[PDB]
A = this chain, B = another copy of it.
Amino acid sequence: QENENLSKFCIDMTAMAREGKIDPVIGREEEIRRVIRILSRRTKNNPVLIGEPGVGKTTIVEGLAQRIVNADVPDNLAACKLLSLDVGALVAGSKYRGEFEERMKGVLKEIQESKETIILFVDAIHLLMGAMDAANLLKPMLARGQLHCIGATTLAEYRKYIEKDAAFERRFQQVLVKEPSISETISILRGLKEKYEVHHGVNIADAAIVAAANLAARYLTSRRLPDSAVDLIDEAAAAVRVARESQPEIIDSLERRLRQLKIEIHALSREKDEASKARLAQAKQDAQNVEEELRPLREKYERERQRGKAIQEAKMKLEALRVKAEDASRMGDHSRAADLQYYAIPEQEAIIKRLEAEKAAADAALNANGADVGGSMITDVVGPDQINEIVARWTGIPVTRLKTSEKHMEQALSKIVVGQKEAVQSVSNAIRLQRSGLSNPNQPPSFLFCGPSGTGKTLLTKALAEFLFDDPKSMIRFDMSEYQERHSLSRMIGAPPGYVGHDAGGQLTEALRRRPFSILLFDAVEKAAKEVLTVLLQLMDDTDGQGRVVDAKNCIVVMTSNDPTTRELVMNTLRNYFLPEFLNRISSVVIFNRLTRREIRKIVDLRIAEIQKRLTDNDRNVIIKVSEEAKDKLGAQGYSPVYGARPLQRLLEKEVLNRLAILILRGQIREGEVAHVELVDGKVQVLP
């Protein structure tokens, strides 16, 4: 009937469903079959697909309505119309008081009168009320009008605006969908590689995608897997188009000098002082040979390029095949079903002919490609490597860990963190239990990092954060004495049993998920009212079928506390603090070392080799030299058990550095002059 407020403000997700524009969502059979039976309840009969942006909670309804027009839907409301009310178009609606609800009330009778057997997907459903956007119109219409709809927005906004009254939850039961794994994406990414390779015109052999979605495993969870794998893979298909088709520069820059000198012979045939004749012969015959050489490739390669446009069309040809039979039987009108399909699908097989030649043609221009220094013609063959650069270019340092594990941690952790001989070892020895798969228990890799009040407890947390996962933003650093006792300790909210992040603010509750592959740390052992201390226990070592609740977390955890003798002292002074059960249920409790000479001396090398980086990374190049005589003033002042080793940096500035750049601005040490610093009384410089 009328489709106006439908059509101009919402799009039918059954249009591309009967048609086939929308990419065929393959798996997800868990949520698809359910929402059918949810939308068929008496109570809680409007499913809400709450989840992250990319999990497929629009793809869910995209594959939901797909198989509704084709085959599978109960003859109770089968092969009907589902329209996606995209409210982003009503967000920016006309101007005055309301002027959105009056346009909304138009959608209402449209759906109430024009064939009531109609479903509605709605994107970012919370905004219709919570926002100015008011959706007060549900109360009779969800009862009297009996509309059928599916929401799609993160439950974080379900916890905000979808629980206002009884009509809110009693009419919408929430359908949880959170994240597919590296093996769940690849499985669902197997079926949608069909649609995403053709819009680009590329053929990947196998290993770009496994390199892709498993690189999308740990890094671009910032924009997590199911829409970052397809974002990433679009670029890997989009990488080669500008590569194979751009007629490689090895050819294109070669011909600009040729036409420079060759076409010059044309007009140079006019009578001038005949110092021109020599340039004719020199530009005729030196440019005549090079003519013969570029003539084969720029055609026979562009003949391979000719097959490329021919095959992309040769494939997009087959697109019309599947859309025909689906509608041939959709209405049950086989008057055109059989007669149209018989002719030839082997347009598929009428095209290998182009492939037989081109296959020998991709690498034979490479076969011909070698005469001098080594240029590379990238053709359509994007591979395990071809994806690695996109990670390398966009996300982080170039391919170092990508190609390391594809085709041991101790030496790296210790050439960066010099102390704690067995501690790094014990951490490494306990970390290989979890990430390898040897034994996977309920608890994450828990550590009670206890040591002297400073010099390395959180420091070992940084060195492994780069190597148990990658990012340094995956550490939320805190001190337990920021929220000393019960009240301010109850302010920090990590994971309440029923609600996660409802009302009160914590850097933990949803920040559990803000850093998935991450470390966690809190530094003040003595600040615990022994209830947060225990809800820690039931979250480390210890969900909705229809219970209507959610909670989870998994990462690595290292608890911090500001020759086993003093251990038992701590163990029993931690008996004066903790429960005996607690001290065994985390892990082998691990201990940090004190400050000595040999460890302090190499960190002096680590702060002058660092001060050389911030010297070498800028413009000027000034060479730095320091002997033991100046070193022994700060070396003893450096290891400071009463405060820590952070005073190394403070008095490095207050003693070392401020007497350094002064001589650059005074004129004693220039950029080519060497700076020596000796200590007799006040550690002054010299240049002997």
Contact = CB atoms under 8 A, between A and B. Distances in A.
A587 interface: yes
A323 interface: no
B477 A240 contact: no
Contact of A53 (B166, B196, B534): B166
Nearest to A483: B530
Interface stretch (A386-394, A411-419, A679-687): A386-394
B382 A202 contact: yes
Given A21-B143, A218-B469, A477-B534, 5 more contacts: A92-B161, A95-B132, A123-B165, A174-B544, A204-B382
Contacts of A564: none
Contact of A534 (B161, B305, B429, B478): B478
A169 interface: yes
Contact of A382 (B239, B305, B470): B239
Contact of A437 (B91, B395, B618): B618
Contacts of A231: 43-44, 546
Nearest to A39: B238
B653 A430 contact: yes
Contact of A37 (B238, B266, B339, B618): B238
Contacts of A605: none
A92 B164 contact: yes
Interface in A457-483: 469-473, 477-479, 481-483
A510 to B, nearest CB: 7
Contacts of A501: 156, 159
Interface string A140-169: 000100000000000110010100111111
Interface string A299-318: 00000010000000000000
A264 interface: yes
A436 to B, nearest CB: 5
A230 to B, nearest CB: 6
B499 A159 contact: yes
A184 interface: no
Contacts of A263: 334, 337-338
Interface in A347-391: 378-384, 386-391
Contacts of A239: 37, 382, 386-387, 389-390
Contact of A211 (B402, B429, B523): B402
Contacts of A95: 132
B305 A75 contact: yes
A36 to B, nearest CB: 6
A236 interface: yes
B650 A587 contact: yes
B165 A124 contact: yes
Given A439-B614, A550-B155, A205 B383 contact: yes
B490 A505 contact: yes
Interface in A552-585: 575, 579-582, 584-585
Contacts of A199: 42
A494 to B, nearest CB: 14
A200 B383 contact: no
Given A43-B234, A136-B89, A479-B580, A548 B223 contact: yes
A103 to B, nearest CB: 12
Contact of A245 (B76, B340, B548): B76
Interface stretch (A288-296, A592-600, A655-663): A655-663
A432 B387 contact: no
Nearest to A468: B218
Contacts of A432: 658, 661
Interface in A217-257: 218-223, 227-228, 230-243, 245-247, 252
B155 A391 contact: no
Contacts of A42: 195-196, 199-200, 230, 234, 237
Contact of A88 (B8, B164, B237, B478): B164
Contacts of A210: 384
Contacts of A86: 139, 165-167
Contacts of A166: 53, 58, 86, 88, 123
Nearest to A272: B343
Interface string A79-106: 0000000111101100100000000000
Nearest 3 Cβ contacts at the A-B interface: A88-B165, A88-B164, A207-B384
A486 interface: yes
A531 interface: yes
A319 interface: no
Contacts of A246: 72-75
Given A500-B159, A588-B654, A92 B130 contact: yes
25 contacts: A40-B200, A43-B231, A73-B246, A86-B165, A88-B168, A92-B129, A156-B501, A174-B548, A203-B380, A204-B381, A204-B383, A222-B547, A235-B394, A236-B382, A237-B382, A239-B389, A240-B379, A263-B334, A268-B338, A394-B545, A436-B664, A438-B614, A478-B534, A481-B575, A486-B505
Interface string A485-517: 010001000000101111001010010001011
A281 interface: no
